[PDB]
Every structure is written in C-alpha cells, then in structure tokens.
Amino acid sequence: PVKPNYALKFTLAGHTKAVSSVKFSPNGEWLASSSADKLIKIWGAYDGKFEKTISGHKLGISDVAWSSDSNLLVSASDDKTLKIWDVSSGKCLKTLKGHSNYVFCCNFNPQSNLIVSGSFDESVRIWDVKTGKCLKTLPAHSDPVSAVHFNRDGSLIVSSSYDGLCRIWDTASGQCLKTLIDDDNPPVSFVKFSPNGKYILAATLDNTLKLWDYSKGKCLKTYTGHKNEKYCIFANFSVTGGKWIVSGSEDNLVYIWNLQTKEIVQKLQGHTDVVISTACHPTENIIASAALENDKTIKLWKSDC
Numbered sequence: 001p002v003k004p005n006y007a008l009k010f011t012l013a014g015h016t017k018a019v020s021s022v023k024f025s026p027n028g029e030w031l032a033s034s035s036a037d038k039l040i041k042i043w044g045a046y047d048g049k050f051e052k053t054i055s056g057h058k059l060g061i062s063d064v065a066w067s068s069d070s071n072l073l074v075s076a077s078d079d080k081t082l083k084i085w086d087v088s089s090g091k092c093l094k095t096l097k098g099h100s101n102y103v104f105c106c107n108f109n110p111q112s113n114l115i116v117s118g119s120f121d122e123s124v125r126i127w128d129v130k131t132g133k134c135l136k137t138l139p140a141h142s143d144p145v146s147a148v149h150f151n152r153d154g155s156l157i158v159s160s161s162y163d164g165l166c167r168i169w170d171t172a173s174g175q176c177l178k179t180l181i182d183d184d185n186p187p188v189s190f191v192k193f194s195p196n197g198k199y200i201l202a203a204t205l206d207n208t209l210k211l212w213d214y215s216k217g218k219c220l221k222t223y224t225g226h227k228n229e230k231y232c233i234f235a236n237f238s239v240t241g242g243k244w245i246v247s248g249s250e251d252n253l254v255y256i257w258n259l260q261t262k263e264i265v266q267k268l269q270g271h272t273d274v275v276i277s278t279a280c281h282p283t284e285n286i287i288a289s290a291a292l293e294n295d296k297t298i299k300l301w302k303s304d305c
C-alpha cells in the first residue's frame with residue numbers, strides 16, 4: 001500500500017513514571033506495559049481498557065515479554081532480577097537472581113521453556129522457566145546489553161550492546177556463532193530477528209536503523225529520518241497489513257517506513273516525550289506506543305491497511 005493511515009484511538013494513563021516497554025500478547029487480547037514506577041499493567045488490546053496492575057519489583061522495570069501461550073510474563077528490573085508472572089493470577093511464580101546489575105532486556109523462546117536476559121553487568125543469561133534456575137551465563141559484551149531476542153525456532157539468540165557489537169549465539173551451547181556488527185562505535189541500541197528469522201533489525205545511536213541478512217552478514221536496508229542518539233528505542237516489523245518498519249523517536253513521534261523502499265510513509269504525532277517503545281498487534285493493524293516521564297502514557301493507533 002502506498003501508505004498506512006494509523007490514527008489515535010485510545011490513550012492509556014495510569015503509570016506514575018516513564019513507561020519502558022509495551023508488548024501485545026500473542027493471542028491478541030492484551031497489551032502489557034512496564035514502567036519505571038515498578039509496575040506492570042495489563043490493558044485490553046482493542047479498547048485500551050485497564051485490566052489489572054501487577055506488582056512486586058523493588059525498583060523500576062525496563063522490559064517485559066509474553067510467553068507463547070499468553071499466560072506468563074517475564075519482567076526485567078533495575079533490582080537486578082527478572083520475575084516470571086502468571087498473568088491471570090498476577091502472582092510472581094519465580095524470581096531469577098544472578099545478574100550483578102540492572103536487567104535491561106528479556107524474552108521467551110518460542111517453546112517458552114527458556115528466558116534470555118541482558119544486563120548492565122555486560123552478560124547474557126539463559127534461564128529455565130520451570131525451575132527459575134540460570135542455565136548459562138554468557139560473557140557476551142563489554143558494556144551494557146541493550147537487547148536480546150530468540151529466532152523463530154529458538155536455536156539462535158541475537159544480542160546487542162553499547163560496546164558497539166551485535167552477536168549471534170547458539171542457544172544450546174551458548175557459544176558465539178557470529179559477530180554481525182564488529183565496531184566499537186556507534187552503540188548498538190536494539191536488535192530483533194525478523195519473523196522468519198532470516199533478517200536482523202538493528203538500531204544504532206546515530207539515528208540509523210538497519211536490516212541485516214543474518215546468513216550473509218550483510219546490510220540490506222537502511223532507515224533514516226528519525227532521531228535516536230540517546231536511548232534504546234524498540235523497533236518492530238509490522239506484518240498484518242503493509243510490510244513496515246516501526247520505531248519510536250527522540251522527537252516524540254512514531255516513525256513508519258516502507259520495508260523495501262526505505263521511505264518514510266507515516267509519522268504519528270501525539271506523545272509529549274521520547275517514544276521509547278512501540279509494538280505491533282499480532283493480527284490487526286494496531287500500534288502501541290509509550291513515552292518517557294514527561295508523558296507517561298500509552299497510545300493505541302489503528303490503520304485501515
């Protein structure tokens with residue numbers, strides 16, 4: 001389609017500090033949000049209706065992520081722990097202790113039997129969901145880890161760091177398979193596998209997004225026009241309608257690019273602070289965006305294509 005037409009439908013207020021990370025449940029019914037106010041909040045994905053608040057962390061939360069069956073959440077906190085939550089009961093099932101600094105990023109594998117985490121302690125850890133035990137500690141980087149993500153079959157982990165590196169790890173052995181970006185500058189602020197696991201979306205703190213061919217280790221696409229020099233902003237593949245790249249920006253907008261042509265197709269105006277997190281609904285043309293302390297709200301946008 002030439003361009004989407006995302007429009008603001010709901011604004012979700014409730015957090016009392018900067019929002020950090022929003023994620024749609026895989027079954028499409030929920031939006032989960034995490035914030036520096038130490039709280040997780042669950043919202044109706046289609047009407048933004050507040051459902052519950054999930055509490056337990058002693059310090060702010062930087063990231064949250066859903067299990068495959070939409071029943072569990074994992075959260076990553078400045079209190080140096082991750083917590084596994086049962087969403088329906090709101091109870092903490094396990095506290096994952098081991099990191100010696102802020103836990104900044106987390107994700108389930110598709111099987112939902114493992115959790116990967118990255119921390120300011122410059123390590124990546126792989127946890128067993130059932131027992132809460134740390135299975136592997138990877139000396140992954142030499143600076144804070146900005147993102148960790150499994151691929152579609154769970155056999156690979158991509159990690160990024162302020163040391164300027166992006167590395168790909170073999171889940172079963174923890175050994176490095178490849179260093180995709182091997183520079184000491186700029187800091188690599190976010191990474192994510194494409195849905196099919198063949199490409200890696202990478203953000204760097206020079207206002208640049210890139211699409212990398214994992215197998216070839218080569219950059220295929222470069223996306224520019226937004227502002228990103230200070231913070232680790234989430235970025236997404238939007239696949240429900242047109243094939244877009246979606247990202248927040250430090251000029252308080254949501255940017256949407258055509259994946260193939262690299263042209264900006266839309267910019268969503270409304271937030272009053274850095275749009276730190278964006279997320280794309282699994283089935284509908286819906287985007288969730290969240291902003292830092294001057295805003296503290298979540299916005300839901302819907303497009304016809």
Ligand SMILES: COc1cc(C(=O)N[C@@H]2CCc3ccc(-c4cn5c(n4)CCC5)cc32)ccc1C
Pocket residue numbers: 018019020021061062063104105106144145146147148162189190230231232233234276
């Ligand atoms: C990594 O080291 C730093 C990062 C920041 C930074 O980005 N702070 C921003 C403000 C608050 C906040 C909350 C969450 C996230 C976040 C989590 N996650 C991503 N962003 C992407 C994936 C998981 C970021 C930020 C600041 C300093 C260092 C040393």
